Amino acid sequence: VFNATRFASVYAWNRKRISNCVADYSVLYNSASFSTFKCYGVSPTKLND
Amino acid sequence: VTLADAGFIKQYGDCLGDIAARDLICAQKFNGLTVLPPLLTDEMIAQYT
Amino acid sequence: IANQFNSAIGKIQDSLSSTASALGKLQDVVNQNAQALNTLVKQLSSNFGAISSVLNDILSRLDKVEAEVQIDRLITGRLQSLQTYVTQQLIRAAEIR
Amino acid sequence: KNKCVNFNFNGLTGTGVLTESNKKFLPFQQFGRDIADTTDAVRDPQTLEILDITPCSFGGVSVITPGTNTSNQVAVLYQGVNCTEVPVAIHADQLTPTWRVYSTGSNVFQTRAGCLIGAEHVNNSYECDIPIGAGICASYQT
Ligand SMILES: *[C@@H]1O[C@H](CO)[C@@H](O[C@@H]2O[C@H](CO)[C@@H](O)[C@H](O)[C@H]2NC(C)=O)[C@H](O)[C@H]1NC(C)=O
Ligand SMILES: *[C@@H]1O[C@H](CO)[C@@H](O)[C@H](O)[C@H]1NC(C)=O
């Protein structure tokens, strides 16, 4: 998702299904690489719980 | 006249399981609301009468 | 006079065995107290403008500072639900007295 | 099961005692809810059985006293409680009231009003001094 060579264009934005897996959101959210990481019904600290 | 709780003890085994679905008095008590018994029993009111 | 008293006491038993609603003054008091308690339990389902009615979900999903603003909304409305219940019960206690 | 715990199912945190349920959940249901919109049953995400959730036992505590210039002796009513829940409270873990010298027992009385500790049950009746409920009163006497 985040490092794939080619993104979709915003008029035809791609959707991937995320399923049957252990996510780690500390591995994402603690990265220095993101200018925006903005949440709308959960704090990004709580995503691992 | 049919009463809704007289106050005369709830001992968990009479309120868990099937009763935790089919009784309002367990939804009241599990939310911090309790009936207290009257000081005179109905048998003492009948002795006065 | 004795046979008329004995027959009139017979009609009390027959009526109390036959009609349903005669103790409606006592049943209305039991119904009002039950309906007021059911109303108070049901006010826990209200969000009062918070993200959830469920206090544990606010604490599962939000950090200390975000959760305080949501919990304050539930405290405000639940405290108002108790102040309403206790005022209505103080007003009913005067009718019963 | 049958023990008071801090549960967390799929991120649903709560405090309660878990029992095996006979509730008939459909495959698309993970939780059941009360009329207060609180979760009151859950399907365990490891082994798909249904667990009833019930809150850890609780009740009012009333303290029964003569005047403090008459005595420092008090009795305690755990109100709406069967006696068994006050020994089972044994303070090797926590409670809301920190004190537990009463739960020594030896002078426990079951009333309809609750579990009464620190008062001797006597068979001979008197006029009501301190009202406990359900026909029971307490008094400070020789
Ligand atoms: C307090 O709880 C105990 C159980 O822990 C109750 O004892 C049961 O009483 C019934 C009716 O006599 C019997 O069928 C059971 O066999 C008893 N069980 C045991 C383990 O003794 C007791 O009745 C309760 N008392 C009150 C007043 O609630
Ligand atoms: C958890 O383990 C049990 C036993 O192996 C299994 O039946 C169940 O399907 C597992 N849960 C998931 C999500 O597969």
Ligand SMILES: *[C@@H]1O[C@H](CO)[C@@H](O)[C@H](O)[C@H]1NC(C)=O
């Ligand atoms: C309370 O008891 C003390 C003695 O311990 C006595 O001096 C006082 O007058 C008493 N007061 C009342 C109101 O009983």
Ligand SMILES: *[C@@H]1O[C@H](CO)[C@@H](O)[C@H](O)[C@H]1NC(C)=O
């Ligand atoms: C009360 O009296 C009965 C006999 O009528 C006796 O069996 C019982 O043990 C007595 N209880 C107390 C607390 O003395």
